[PDB]
Enzyme design. Sequence first.
Site, PDB file in Angstrom:
ATOM      1  N   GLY A  34       0.749  -1.261   0.000  1.00 22.09           N
ATOM      2  CA  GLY A  34       0.000   0.000   0.000  1.00 22.09           C
ATOM      3  C   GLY A  34       0.772   1.300   0.000  1.00 22.09           C
ATOM      4  N   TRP A  36       2.303   2.980  -2.667  1.00 21.46           N
ATOM      5  CA  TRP A  36       1.746   3.841  -3.710  1.00 21.46           C
ATOM      6  C   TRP A  36       0.328   4.257  -3.369  1.00 21.46           C
ATOM      7  CZ3 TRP A  36       2.915   2.804  -9.556  1.00 21.46           C
ATOM      8  CH2 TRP A  36       4.309   2.826  -9.758  1.00 21.46           C
ATOM      9  N   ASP A  51      -4.629  -6.459  -6.343  1.00 21.49           N
ATOM     10  CA  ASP A  51      -3.436  -7.250  -6.075  1.00 21.49           C
ATOM     11  C   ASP A  51      -3.807  -8.700  -5.847  1.00 21.49           C
ATOM     12  OD1 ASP A  51      -0.895  -8.259  -4.474  1.00 21.49           O
ATOM     13  OD2 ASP A  51      -0.410  -6.240  -5.061  1.00 21.49           O
ATOM     14  N   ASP A  67      -6.204 -11.834  -9.768  1.00 20.01           N
ATOM     15  CA  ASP A  67      -5.051 -12.035 -10.635  1.00 20.01           C
ATOM     16  C   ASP A  67      -5.423 -11.387 -11.957  1.00 20.01           C
ATOM     17  OD1 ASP A  67      -3.182 -13.008 -12.542  1.00 20.01           O
ATOM     18  OD2 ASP A  67      -3.075 -14.979 -11.613  1.00 20.01           O
ATOM     19  N   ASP A  95       2.639  -0.983 -10.398  1.00 16.54           N
ATOM     20  CA  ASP A  95       3.931  -1.359  -9.829  1.00 16.54           C
ATOM     21  C   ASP A  95       3.983  -2.880  -9.721  1.00 16.54           C
ATOM     22  OD1 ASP A  95       6.436  -0.569  -8.825  1.00 16.54           O
ATOM     23  OD2 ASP A  95       5.714  -0.660  -6.746  1.00 16.54           O
ATOM     24  N   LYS A 135       5.653   0.079 -14.178  1.00 17.04           N
ATOM     25  CA  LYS A 135       6.985  -0.443 -13.915  1.00 17.04           C
ATOM     26  C   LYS A 135       7.303  -1.524 -14.955  1.00 17.04           C
ATOM     27  CE  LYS A 135       8.004  -3.060 -10.318  1.00 17.04           C
ATOM     28  NZ  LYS A 135       7.955  -3.042  -8.823  1.00 17.04           N
TER      29      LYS A 135
END
Length: 175
Positions: A34, A36, A51, A67, A95, A135
């Site tokens: 958590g 970000w 997530d 997922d 990320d 990312k």
Amino acid sequence: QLRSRAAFKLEFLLDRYRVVRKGDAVIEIGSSPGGWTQVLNSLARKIISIDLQEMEEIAGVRFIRCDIFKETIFDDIDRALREEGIEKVDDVVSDAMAKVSGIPSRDHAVSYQIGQRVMEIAVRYLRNGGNVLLKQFQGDMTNDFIAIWRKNFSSYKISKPSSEIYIMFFGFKAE
Ligand SMILES: C[S@@+](CC[C@H](N)C(=O)[O-])C[C@H]1O[C@@H](n2cnc3c(N)ncnc32)[C@H](O)[C@@H]1O
């Protein structure tokens, strides 16, 4: 989590590139634990965070355990947006990363596959003028990835806050 390494990376990127703007609605991919999310919560009007792993609740953040590669992801995001009264979000940020092998080629490969799915989500849900931050571990596929996806955007930037980079796409055009 405001003080985590990941949080500092996002603060650096917001200072330099304003990739998320005050009042934006954001789909955040790879949110746990958590860092970000806590940085974004100071700026965004609404965050839908996704997530594989649980993370602690943050007031007003809509968390979805999911997922992104599996079958429910679009139904899950559709439902969350509908409940928030949002048609198109302002930004999609990611990320997300799986376990790291320490081998640039392998970590690139895993990261690229995540990036592809993040972009598929972005083009589905982004408003015209919206942004992406993602990312990626740099490798063979990076320049081609940028060349392909930047066709849907006004511009792009790459930053390094040692093969990890952040790719940003600015100003989505459905046209
Ligand atoms: C580097 S950690 C993210 C840290 C986060 N930005 C923060 O500041 O706390 C990467 C996250 O990506 C998530 N992730 C990896 N693959 C995923 C997938 N296929 N679907 C959803 N989340 C995934 C992982 O579970 C992990 O929690």
